[PDB]
Amino acid sequence: PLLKSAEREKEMASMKEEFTRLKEALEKSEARRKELEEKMVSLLQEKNDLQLQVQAEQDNLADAEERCDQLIKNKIQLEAKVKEMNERLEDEEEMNAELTAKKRKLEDECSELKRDIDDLELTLAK
Amino acid sequence: ASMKEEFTRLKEALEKSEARRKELEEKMVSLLQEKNDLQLQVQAEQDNLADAEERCDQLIKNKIQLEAKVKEMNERLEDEEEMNAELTAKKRKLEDECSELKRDIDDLELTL
Ligand SMILES: [Hg+2]
């Protein structure tokens, strides 16, 4: 063009591209911002959902633990019963031994008595 | 407005946008720490629950072993209890034989 029409058209073409560039810089920034807005929303929901699993698992451990408690009180009563039964067995066995001894010594005496009765009948008879 | 105010509006919109983004980038760092920690915590707790459950099973097996041992002993005790009672009866019959025998010895000795 001629000097003046070229200079005028040049400034207009420059302002259009400068504008177009600012517009795109904004669009891009907005995109990054939007992607983050979405990520932050998703993470907060993820975090709060885990805070509930922690609670829930802690509760299951509480129920598991309480079950151990009952079992342990039960083991206590049972070990007490074993101790007690073993004591009685010893008493029984000991007594049994003692009775068997007395029954045998009585047996030796009936042997001897029947023998002495026979000796006196020998003395008497002849 | 004029072209200059339109550009000024755009620069400010960008500065604002970029600023909001810095807000998010910094707030996110701390947010991920929290999420990773809670994820590891749930794994830790699940491990505890498995170990707790395992202790339950050992106790249950032990409980069974004991109740059985108690039963076996109750029955064995009853046998001993009956065994001693039968002996006591025998011992007693013999004692009465001694009594009778000693009496017969007395009667024969009076004959002499
Ligand atoms: Hg348990």
Ligand SMILES: [Hg+2]
């Ligand atoms: Hg006797």
